[PDB]
Design a protein around this nucleic acid. Structure first.
Lengths: 154, 96
RNA sequence: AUAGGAGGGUGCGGCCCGAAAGGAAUGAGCCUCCCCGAAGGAAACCGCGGCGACGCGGGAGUACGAGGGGAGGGGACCGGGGUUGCACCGUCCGUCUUGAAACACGGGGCAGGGAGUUCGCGGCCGUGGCGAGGUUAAGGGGGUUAAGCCCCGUAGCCGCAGGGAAACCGACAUGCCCGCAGCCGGGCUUAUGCCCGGUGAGGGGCGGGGUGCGAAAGCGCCCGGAGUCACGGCCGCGAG
RNA sequence: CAGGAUGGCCUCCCCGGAGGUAGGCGGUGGGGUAGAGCACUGAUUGGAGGUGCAGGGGGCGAAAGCCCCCGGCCUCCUGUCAAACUCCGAACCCACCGCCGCCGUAGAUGGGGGGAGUAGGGUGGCGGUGUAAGCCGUCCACCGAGAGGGGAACAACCCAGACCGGGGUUAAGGCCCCAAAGUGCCGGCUAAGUGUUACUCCAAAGGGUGUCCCGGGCCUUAGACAGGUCGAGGUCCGGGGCCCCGAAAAUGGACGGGGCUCAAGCCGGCCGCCGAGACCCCGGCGCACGGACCGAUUGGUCCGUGAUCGGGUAGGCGGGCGUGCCGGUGGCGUAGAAGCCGGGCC
RNA sequence: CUCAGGCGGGUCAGGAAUCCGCCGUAGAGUGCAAGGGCAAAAGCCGGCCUGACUGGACCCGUAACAGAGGCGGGUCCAGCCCCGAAAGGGUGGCCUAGCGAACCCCUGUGCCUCCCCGGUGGGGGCCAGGGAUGACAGAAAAGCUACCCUGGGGAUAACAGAGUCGUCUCGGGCGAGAGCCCAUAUCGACCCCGAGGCUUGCUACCUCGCUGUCGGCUCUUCCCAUCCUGGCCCUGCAGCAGGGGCCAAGGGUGGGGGUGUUCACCCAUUAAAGGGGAACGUGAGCUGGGUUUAGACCGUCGUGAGACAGGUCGGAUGCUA
RNA sequence: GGUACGGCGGCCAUAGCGGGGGGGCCACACCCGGUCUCAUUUCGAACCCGGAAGUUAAGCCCCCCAGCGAUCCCGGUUGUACUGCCCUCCGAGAGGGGGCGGGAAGCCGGGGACGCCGCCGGCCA
């Protein structure tokens, strides 16, 4: 399963282990998203940094929309259907379907940056950034509901 | 009051044996053998007072780089320095 | 002459100046119309969900949108400056200190003056000359208005062999391995490039050797040629 | 001991050439803290049984010793402990190995050289100490050395780390007025202006048929309680929420102020808005690295990457502006030099 | 070979002399503190010995990470030896304390060396051991200052402010009781919970390129935990009075003796002659009696200079807003 | 290949302490006697030497147990005590709480457990 992880809290008052975990996850700034696997190592990293991020399962439609809108290449060039077809031979929707199914990975698309720099959500986060999602905040694991947040952040 | 470090400073429990393990240990650890490049843990046997390394290194894992007399030469990484110890095989345990 | 904050900051308004050096009659502020457009982004109205604030689908990614272009009208300002008003913000400068607006110290105004300099020794770097050699010192001759310029000057100093308190003894111009760059052969790749295998200066490690201590083994230092001079800079020590 | 030296932490240059480990997963080992417990060592209430056991008190006997009480010593039951106790024992930390992730041939790990500054720290959590304030360490988060948006102002608390000109959306938090955004919605509580306080500031023991509820017993709709008569719920207890009493200070005055009572307070939830230099987008600058092309002494033009460049005290490094004089080179000036006063442009 | 302690049995012999048996995980011992380790031993009893030796190498600790003179420790090579049948062990004490640079001097040993050369006496050098610096990473070493001076320090005391409230002042909870019965008219043990900043102490946060002290006089203002005046409640309140408590800060709360005194004591009156805050209010308003310089005396301490939070006499108070 | 035989060992109590029953082809013992080897701080008690008259009483070998000690598993106490990270959650304070990740000790009940394994030899076949 593919997990989308978005950084929530800022870069101040962060201790060294959590800061280095976030740097290894490539979440250097707020409103930044990455796609990883549900392997035990990644799960342990998410557990270590759970107080500053929110993660969940992402479906193929949301992944395709994210790639089309906020995906970028080296040099911050936009990702287009023509480029995707020329490099891989299929549409962005099919590429996202296969990535979610596990038959390929984002790295299969050449010169694709692994970080999506999202926009602040429409209507804002619907919870305090000091509590967890289960309590009503905006931190920690939220499951399938991460798709709604990604939709609000493009 | 500052107290300088000595060989037996604060070793009341570290260098104490289980009541049911009092006495001479089994001879397998005494007669065990190692090869160059093997990694070994350091578990000091309190009853044997010969070839004992500093208790500060008790519990660490080192690598065997030679053998002088009856004692093995063990290399450890204390911070960034390489430290060489001459440890009797009774104080050593193979890794895995 | 009814208004409060270290005397300022952002924006604009009122009054006033506005020849030159800024733009401008080859057209200013200004007025009207058309095209494209990033991130973002409504609503009238219709249908539905909720006790409610309200929300969801269509309208619609539409109207609008930083900015980028075009056309028409008019005919002298715009930029800039002095003062002041309004809205919001703003407790001076230097200094020791964990901590300065401080009821902690130095602070009436202006003009001039004012604080890492020189030598000797040493470490290092940037560059240049010569090179198993490098370099002159004091001084001498030629020439010159002149102290500038030209030539000579091997005494001396460092280096070429180190070890030892001393007596004293006295070493690889490459025997072997690993190996970066470069070179050579091959494979893939549009190309760059990557990989495999050799050779590999410099680099690293063995082996061997000189000497000191030792009865010896064995250890310390040294051994397969790069040093020397000059200009400039940083620093250490002694001189105020 | 207001001072120095060697290290640690910063910066600049060079050699060398393929590994490195701040985070995670699994494994191989180490530990005796928290908690707990009496199995050692030392404490600790009462009872029962055994032991004359060198004890004491009486009665009792010439003398050999008895009878009880108490005391001591063991076992069991009962009720309690330990920073200098442990038959047990976490969370967690450390060493090593494999892997994921990240960094590295645009040169890391590492090595050599040059220059420093620093030897008063503070707040915050934890530990020892103290009535407390405080003192002494530890953790490296924030101030020191840190802008902007808030807590009324605040070093430390929350958001947030910042090149320049613009557009948009969010963060802390807020929406009765001051003051941008609701006199917003559903259910309940408070009658004390309690409260209107995330933290830097906030009063207790003991009480309240003051109110709103939960649970458990006795009688229990003309068989209950109050005063054999009436004729519907009473009797008690243990709890939960808000509030009340306990509650006295000195210039006049503090929820920031006004003020606020089916709130503009509290409790359990929700809806929509407003709000930063944060995040997104367009344009510009510089920097780091790599590339092409071009300079008769350090360089110059242009392209490529930067989510992984842009705060800054001590300090290190690079470039540039200004002043007097000398060797050259090219010039200006009585048709007006230097200097001075007010303006325009870069 | 097995200890400490205990039990049972034994001539004097008993609590305790010596002896037999059994239980006995160390409850003994190991030179000396404590911790750790030791049971066919590291303990006890015997035999034989001097490895508590000579010439050297590497490594760990003091001093983690992360630099080190000196010192301590560990693993080994060689020589000469000791014990043992042999394996094996021996570089002091089962491990962790009992100790020390330069210069100089003394001793051991066998080499080098002293200015043209050689001999002798003497000197210098290399290696090893020793004499100590306890302020123990190594000066040789008594005090006063009130006649004091300089550079500084709120890195640091006294006065005052700030934090705290142990202490101080003032309350509260329960009720053993004392009150002829009756806990609550009144007092209220032993315990427990607080308020104030009005006593003192603690900290050292602001102030040492100066914020002028105590007391008194003058003057203004504030708090209530109320002494009198106004109004009430309980009473072990007959009246006159008392004891306890509540509301209430408009007004009053005075004059004198000794003492520098605040305070406390005393006197005669009075309705009463309240306690406190305002930089312990008020010295650019006063006075200067005390304290706290420079002079001097007494007592005590010191060899002395001298000192005393011990007395005693004298000892300056700046101003044009 | 069999053996209620022995020697040398590994883990070092789930293996120990204490009880009940059975056995000796061989083998192991108890046992008989001290000239020689060896010894008593006396003692042939131990150790040693020379043996097989007697015994399986016990050391030993085989089977069993759960009184003590130890220790493995399951259920309850219990996700209790304790604890890592974050927090604009409550509390006058002491302290507690929410989310994610770990998790005892002791006690009660029911089972387990009176050891497992390696090399070789003796006797018989």
């Amino acid at each position: 399963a593919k997990l989308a992880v978005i950084r929530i809290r800022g870069r101040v008052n962060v201790k060294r282990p959590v800061r280095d975990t976030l740097a290894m996850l490539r979440l250097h700034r707020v409103n930044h998203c990455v796609i990883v696997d549900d392997t035990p190592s990644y799960l342990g990293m998410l557990q270590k940094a759970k107080d500053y991020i929110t993660w969940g399962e992402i479906n193929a439609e949301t992944l395709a929309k994210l790639i089309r809108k906020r995906g970028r290449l080296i040099g911050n060039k936009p990702v287009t259907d023509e480029y995707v077809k020329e490099k891989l031979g299929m549409t962005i929707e099919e590429f996202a379907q296969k990535v979610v199914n596990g038959e390929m990975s984002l790295k299969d698309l050449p010169n694709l940056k692994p970080v999506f720099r999202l926009h602040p959500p429409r209507g804002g986060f619907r919870g305090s950034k000091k509590r967890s999602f289960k309590e009503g905040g905006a931190l920690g694991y939220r499951g399938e509901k991460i798709n709604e947040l990604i939709e609000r952040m493009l | 009051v500052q107290k300088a470090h000595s060989f037996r400073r604060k070793t009341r429990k570290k260098l104490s044996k289980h009541p049911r393990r009092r006495g001479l240990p089994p001879l397998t650890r005494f007669l065990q053998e190692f090869e160059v490049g093997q990694r070994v843990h350091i578990v000091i046997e309190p009853s044997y007072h010969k070839g004992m390394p500093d208790p500060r290194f008790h519990g660490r894992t080192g690598t065997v780089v030679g053998k002088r007399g009856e004692a093995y030469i063990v290399e450890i990484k204390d911070g960034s320095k390489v430290k060489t110890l001459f440890i009797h095989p009774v104080h050593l345990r193979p890794q895995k």
